[model samples]
Target chain A: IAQARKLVEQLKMEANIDRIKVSKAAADLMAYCEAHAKEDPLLTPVPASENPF
Target chain B: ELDQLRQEAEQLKNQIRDARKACADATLSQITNNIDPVGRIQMRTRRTLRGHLAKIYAMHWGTDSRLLVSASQDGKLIIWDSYTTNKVHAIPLRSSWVMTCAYAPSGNYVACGGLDNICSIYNLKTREGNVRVSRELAGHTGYLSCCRFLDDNQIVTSSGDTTCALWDIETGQQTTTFTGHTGDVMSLSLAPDTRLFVSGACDASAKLWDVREGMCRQTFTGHESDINAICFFPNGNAFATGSDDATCRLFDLRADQELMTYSHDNIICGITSVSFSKSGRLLLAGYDDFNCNVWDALKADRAGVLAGHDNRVSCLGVTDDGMAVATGSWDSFLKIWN
Candidate 1:
């Protein structure tokens, strides 16, 4: 979860985001991720399937 | 020769008299004052709710009743129940500023794009509790400007990267890319038929494209400055575009000619969302002038200008009731006036 948060922060900076606004957006995305994880699996990574074809 | 000269002098004197009469007629003005002459009184601006800390960028009233959604430069997405005069929910994101947002045609979901180059979707039925980051459609090298759901399963987005793309919502895969604008594509509107879409760019041109073939059908070029927004009329036969040149132009697709133009005082810095009344008799335009002007589309006369915003008016959406209008502005406010 910490790594994912860090990644989001980095992406925001790389996008040349306005600092105040990016933080607000991050909060919204994070809150949404926490409330509905099933709908958005991209919020956190899960282990790959055992069969690595 | 003397007789001919006399005749010419007489003709010149007559022409001077006509010109003077025309000038005097121009100065003669008529004034009539009669309030409530129409007999049917209309109630406008029933109420105003103000309180936001930063500039607002995008706004829309959901198809599901009287819900209003606004995305701001402060990176917040606010949902309001305009009918109830309450703030129902607020969602903040990681972008510097939100550029545009749209509700799904079915009104079950919403998609918003920001300076982050990613598009996020949320389900509105569950309220903020079911707020989910459904899918991230990414491809633009710069800021994502706008996104609209084409149907239940597909979405189209425009960006400052100079490209517009179509994405499959289920797979989160970019199905097709449309690129030709020399500058940033800021706004896009899908036609009522859903077979076509129009895009406005900073390139001073608005182009119409056929979605299936992925080809631009025609490009309308006349604005001297950046084209900030474009939206097709509900009938799909005509469209309107606003530009930084301080002018809004209406174009008829069937006639392939610009039908009308409205001049504004300042540069149109944001999206000019145009919508026809449910009856299709009146046209409404929201502009950076901090006012939404209602116009008679056929006669091209100003019907009324609703003023409430202190800063640039970014976007607006009309409810199906045709009795109210919701406007988002750079003053950090979302206003609904009846």
Candidate 2:
């Protein structure tokens, strides 16, 4: 489990960046992603007919 | 035990990724409502500056926002009074295969480089004809790709040799060099706060550098192919990159991660250049498909598509005042849009 421990440490450092509370942010993010992730049009596929060129 | 630990690490990594994405979304959502009061009208080509005999390779606007310079395959660099559509100065280059050109912030000097592997500067105030190179900052073993002046005396450049260098114009010497990219360094953008700059390369990554310390602060990765273009958001807190993968991505430096990706399956042509509108709400990206796609930065939706160029739109620049934008194309013309 040493590798896991190392990653846990890394995650802690990343989480503490700018001293912001990421846990709460992550919780809110989970909710947002759950609601809108699949619906994000930026990631949607465009067909050939939509090609303007 | 090792397998279990490995899986644990992977899960933790994904968790962190999700958290970062979440933070970005929250930030964007909060700022989306404070829309700028100045609204841009439907952008149409206002002026078509035509003089180049070959494909336009690159162009940059002077700080005055009215003058511009363009480098072309015809072996000439033409300075234009963009407002009047008149050529201010058309200087024949020592070598015509230029990949990039930049206008100095002071509007007194301009620089260009390419197959000659030398960043040559010209003082526009001096003698008009046969404008000799005021200084040739030569060190890169490969072709020069991009150059940007920090001020009158300092300039930085990226090269196909996979490195970026800072030059002292007055001393005509290389002061510092930054190396990290594994492929040709194709583009560079100076942050609004001139101390920081970013370089995009064929290695499919972009890096942020601290000029004073000559150190790379972060490496941004997401593109599947060469990052052909990169530009800082107007706020300087974020940046955007365009790549041969046919997508443009926004990365937040504060979040230290990518915030969103802009692409469509139907638009498979590689992006050639990208710039941000003044309000940071619109992203203008030029593509190999002969179109400039305007994207809503916060909404992550298509704002509009600029469709007039007959060939690939090779270079793009938003004016300093944020009132206009210019696009140069292989069709041998530069069109001013507002």
Candidate 3:
């Protein structure tokens, strides 16, 4: 729940961003995930754009 | 009583006459009516994004519409979250007079360009300091002015070099070069079909091009001054141009057609940017007076205005989802109107 909570906070910080329609209680569930979340990058490394022309 | 019926018919005639001026790309969902204008700018300012130190040069909405990334003459690109009304990221750019910035359709990458004549691609979700597009496209002989992705993997760039070029994202190769404008190509609009795009330039005209054939398909010749901005209509059957002539003209891209022009009451300055609603219902244009005007594509009615900026309204855009309209100004501010 703490892990989820951290994730939720991370999201709560940026969600309405240019998009979103989240709810309160569902957001609360994230505490567990937040406490257990990865502190680093979530996705694989971004590859370089192809060589310049 | 017969004369009274004639009066009713005349009112109906006047009503139709006004709504009939809509452009070919005007939104089908909200066509103008005699009762009420549907796509007018919401005069109430919802939010004013501030922080850029210099004049705003470009603004592009991410595919998600929630992220609006803006670049300024200060050489910084800021990604703003509309919901939170804060910057997601503020990255320093290498270009001194950066005029190009866009969020790729997938939202994974962001690109910026400027007087330096290089398009830098940055990874949006980067865990490292930041990443740049692998190879810099060094073809434009003049200052880079604007750019946008044709899709997820390719980009089209315009320049003061009097040309527009298409580059492959994954290969870093020049896929196509669109030329013909005698003056600098200032801007371009990609069509929904992906096979066609249109460019407006200092040459005082807008040219429609077929990417598949890599050739100029048609030229729209009605503007009396340099053409600075252009956009594709929702249906791709036509396009619109904003010009120094202080007018926005809609051209039907057929064998040959007269480009019908629309103007505002203010005639002293030029139009810097223009956009069309997804429903093809309205035209939004930014003016040197720091005002963004909304127009009825049909009947050419002046629907309303979004006025607040203290300087030139340099860039105008509708959200990718077509949910909101955004305007950036030389006043160093950006605003989003839903």
Candidate 4:
């Protein structure tokens, strides 16, 4: 359930590469998305492959 | 031309966009009290209307900006005309709980469903025997939680039984059953053209179904928890989903990617309802916090809050004219903000 998140940001703007931070447990989930130009941020990694419970 | 630029300068007047901003600002000013959504006022108690005996569940507004209909746990539906701010009509139900409701596209009929597992279609022009209830459509085994008129002659319903079905109002029979969700189907939103509709469920996903073919076209996966509410984006190219995960996400239907996520740092509640403004630019979201948050779809952040209601905000809807907003809560009252 922790992976059920989308970064909130301005859609019409260009992407910023340095701002992305991700969690390990949800890396697989976020990585599955087609592509994200921007809005990536602090993704805190969990010890296990946790589900959004 | 220099003259055109001068006219543009006169129009720009401390705003964000150009010609498009003028139109969006006109829409934003409707309930925002101005072009910005910094906050909402309580309205000095004049707009509050109370009549139901139990918690209020859902509220819908007619095509005309003046009429609002609300359903409640009291087994009653009330059509309140905002013109006089009075209870215009009331229909008592045989069901113990009536939660979801809809107004016919033409504004001549009202349809609602509840614990009795029935959808009651009431014609406004009826002159004989219980003028409010003109027809009863029944078939689902579980409680009806959401319902909407596809047009004037057809309707769709969602139930706790994990299926969403379509019906013909004239014959009162199930015409199509779009089945795929493994858990209870809780919410539904028909596309703008009525060609397709979307459903959210306790199964942790949302599906887009082709109405004519009666088959699932695409399955949206991302929400890890129950997806409680779904609504079409303005252009119907995408949709917004509210989940028990305490967030709202927008996805473009043509692609597998999510467009934006709407949430704020202070918000800690699940969204119960969502609707787009008339211009289809801003999103009005009802929360477990009893406050309705309006977010700018372009910016992906809350612009303002419609603060009233004491209990959890149960249901919400905007008028077709986009001039007013109606909200229902477990507090047993429905409030209108114009």
lDDT of 2 by residue, A21-42 (tens): 3333333333443354244322
Q: Lowest lDDT 10-mer window, candidate 1 chain B?
A: B26-35
Residue lDDT tens for model 2, B68-108: 99999999899998778888899889998998999999988
- The C-alpha TM-scores of every prediction are 0.71, 0.81, 0.75, 0.74
lDDT, candidate 1, A1-53, per-residue tens? 55444333433322331222222322332343234433311112223452111
lDDT of 1 by residue, B54-135 (tens): 8878877666547777787777677777767787767777675678887787877778888788888877677547676777
Evaluation by TM-score, superior candidate among 1 and 4: 4
Please list all clashing residue pairs in model 1, or write none if there are none: A25-B93, A25-B94, A26-B93, A26-B94, A28-B92
Error of 3 at B313 (Å): 0.6
Q: Which stretches of candidate 3 lie over 4 Å from their true place?
A: A1-53, B1-41, B128-134
> What lDDT would each prediction earn against the true structure?
0.65, 0.81, 0.70, 0.70
Interface Cα root-mean-square deviation for all models: 30.6, 11.8, 27.2, 22.8
Candidate 2: which pairs clash? A46-B265
lDDT of 2: 0.81
lDDT by residue for model 4 (B267-329), tens? 878989988765555678899988888776544656667888899888877665555667889
Q: Which candidate number would show the highest TM-score if scored against the true structure?
A: 2
Give me the overall lDDT of model 4: 0.70
